[PDB]
Design an enzyme around this catalytic site. Sequence first.
Site, short mmCIF file in Angstrom:
data_model
loop_
_atom_site.label_atom_id
_atom_site.label_comp_id
_atom_site.label_asym_id
_atom_site.label_seq_id
_atom_site.Cartn_x
_atom_site.Cartn_y
_atom_site.Cartn_z
N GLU A 199 -35.41 28.97 -25.76
CA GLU A 199 -35.32 27.67 -26.43
C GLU A 199 -36.30 26.68 -25.84
OE1 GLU A 199 -34.07 27.65 -29.39
OE2 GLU A 199 -33.01 29.48 -29.13
N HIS A 207 -39.68 27.14 -27.22
CA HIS A 207 -39.88 26.42 -28.50
C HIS A 207 -40.13 24.94 -28.17
CE1 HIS A 207 -38.80 29.64 -31.19
NE2 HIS A 207 -37.55 29.58 -30.87
N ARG A 231 -48.16 30.88 -6.11
CA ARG A 231 -48.08 31.97 -5.14
C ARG A 231 -49.44 32.38 -4.65
NH1 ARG A 231 -43.67 32.59 -8.73
NH2 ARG A 231 -45.12 33.51 -10.20
N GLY A 260 -40.65 54.38 -4.23
CA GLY A 260 -39.30 54.63 -3.69
C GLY A 260 -39.21 56.12 -3.39
N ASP A 293 -59.46 52.23 -0.35
CA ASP A 293 -58.00 52.25 -0.40
C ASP A 293 -57.39 52.98 0.79
OD1 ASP A 293 -58.01 51.17 -2.93
OD2 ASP A 293 -58.94 52.91 -3.73
N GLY A 321 -46.32 59.71 2.37
CA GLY A 321 -44.90 59.54 2.81
C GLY A 321 -44.38 60.98 2.93
N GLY A 343 -42.39 64.54 1.30
CA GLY A 343 -42.52 65.26 0.03
C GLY A 343 -43.87 65.96 -0.10
N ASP A 386 -64.91 56.01 -6.51
CA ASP A 386 -63.53 55.92 -6.04
C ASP A 386 -63.56 55.88 -4.49
OD1 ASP A 386 -62.68 56.22 -8.65
OD2 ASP A 386 -61.41 57.99 -8.16
N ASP A 393 -49.49 68.87 0.92
CA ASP A 393 -50.14 67.85 0.06
C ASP A 393 -51.35 68.45 -0.66
OD1 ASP A 393 -48.39 65.88 0.70
OD2 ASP A 393 -49.54 65.31 2.52
CA LIG Z 1 -50.05 35.72 -4.03
CA LIG Z 2 -41.82 58.30 -3.99
CA LIG Z 3 -60.89 53.92 -3.79
CA LIG Z 4 -44.14 61.22 -1.06
CA LIG Z 5 -58.52 50.61 -5.45
CA LIG Z 6 -46.53 64.50 1.89
ZN LIG Z 7 -36.12 31.07 -31.34
#
Ligand SMILES: [Ca+2]
Ligand SMILES: [Ca+2]
Ligand SMILES: [Ca+2]
Ligand SMILES: [Ca+2]
Ligand SMILES: [Ca+2]
Ligand SMILES: [Ca+2]
Ligand SMILES: [Zn+2]
Length: 468
Positions: free
Chosen positions: A174, A177, A250, A331, A362, A367, A369, A380, A397
């Site tokens: 609302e 609007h 922010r 996660g 990067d 982690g 797994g 890259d 991995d």
């Molecule tokens: Ca920020």
């Molecule tokens: Ca994960």
């Molecule tokens: Ca990269």
């Molecule tokens: Ca992992």
């Molecule tokens: Ca990147």
């Molecule tokens: Ca791993």
């Molecule tokens: Zn509306």
Amino acid sequence: TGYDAVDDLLHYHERGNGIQINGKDSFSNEQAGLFITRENQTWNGYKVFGQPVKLTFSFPDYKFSSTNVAGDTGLSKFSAEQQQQAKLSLQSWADVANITFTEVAAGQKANITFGNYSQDRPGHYDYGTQAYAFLPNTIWQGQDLGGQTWYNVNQSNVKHPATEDYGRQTFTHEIGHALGLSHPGDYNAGEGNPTYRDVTYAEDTRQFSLMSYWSETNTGGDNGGHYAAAPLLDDIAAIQHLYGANLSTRTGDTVYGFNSNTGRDFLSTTSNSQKVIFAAWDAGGNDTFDFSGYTANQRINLNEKSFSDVGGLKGNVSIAAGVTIENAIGGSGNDVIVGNAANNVLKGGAGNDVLFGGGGADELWGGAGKDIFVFSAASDSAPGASDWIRDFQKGIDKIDLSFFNKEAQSSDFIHFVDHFSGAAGEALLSYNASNNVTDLSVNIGGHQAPDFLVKIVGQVDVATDFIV
Ligand SMILES: [Ca+2]
Ligand SMILES: [Ca+2]
Ligand SMILES: [Ca+2]
Ligand SMILES: [Ca+2]
Ligand SMILES: [Ca+2]
Ligand SMILES: [Ca+2]
Ligand SMILES: [Zn+2]
Ligand SMILES: [Ca+2]
């Protein structure tokens, strides 16, 4: 392959172009923003776009037996809980555009007012309507109606917006609007029995805009029975079009999701159960999408205007146009994390994850797994700005370079050698046992020197750790 999962996420919810979705035309973020603001009404004047605005708002003390401009009666002042929630909704709008809101006295004149109604005629309770508002410059009998917002307090969501998310969403809608936004369509089609079938563009859904009335499921989203509390992707384009983007929001290092420092209920979560739904607006700093506390399989895309599948929901997190989010933490589920051209810190967490750094230098952490690190371009990981794989586990991995042979349509393009000869496609592994670092160098371009270099912490077994 790792690459297929990346490719899929990168092409999730593609729009504009000459795309057609539910048999309807697809509009880009920008097109949708313009369309939602098609009435061209602003608090700065008709067709006056991009200027900041200062607005006052209040909670008038209405008389029950009084009648409002639309003819509803059984009026009342917003309660404490309603007031609290309306203030959160205003703030959500002030965070993304150059709008300043100031609360004034019940008595005084305000630009935006909030009031409850309960009857459609004296002594007759209305259980069928929800709320309505007037866009700026709505002139009735020489009186500006613009800024007035009204809600049916007979609806529990309106009465208890702190516990009923549809109620909080209604407030934000609302107010939208009251700022100059419209529904993304007129749906004037046929009669007054509108359906998603009646939209002008495919992205007219609650997945893209809270100004919409159509289910996010119409476009492939799934908010799990929840409702977004703050402006979505297309809502941000629309409001920034009217009042300019808020460059002060922010600007420090911000964490979204778990361990949030946002101070926003809709950008934070403290448990697996509390689901997030938001469109991220951020003006500066090194930021992180922390979704470490969720157990479902997530897909996190850090590119601008892209959608993520977070906490078990589908396409519930997105990034506004012009925002750079730098880091992502998955996660315990099996995730897909795609970075952007900036330097990113990507952490998979437990589960079998797929990480893709994209351009920049990067830092990748699989982690626990069985993880896969994917690459699709020499840029890259260019020598000079190499990616680092900080916890590679040999025999567990994998390094996915499958993109190159696939594109070359040749099984022998990428091939491992003991020494470089200058041939394109040559790949070399150099392991330093003293410092626990393996260098993966590839001559993709075919130059005098390799154009691709990844630094890996750990040993890599060429016989089992690659996808080529
Ligand atoms: Ca920020
Ligand atoms: Ca994960
Ligand atoms: Ca990269
Ligand atoms: Ca992992
Ligand atoms: Ca990147
Ligand atoms: Ca791993
Ligand atoms: Zn509306
Ligand atoms: Ca940033």
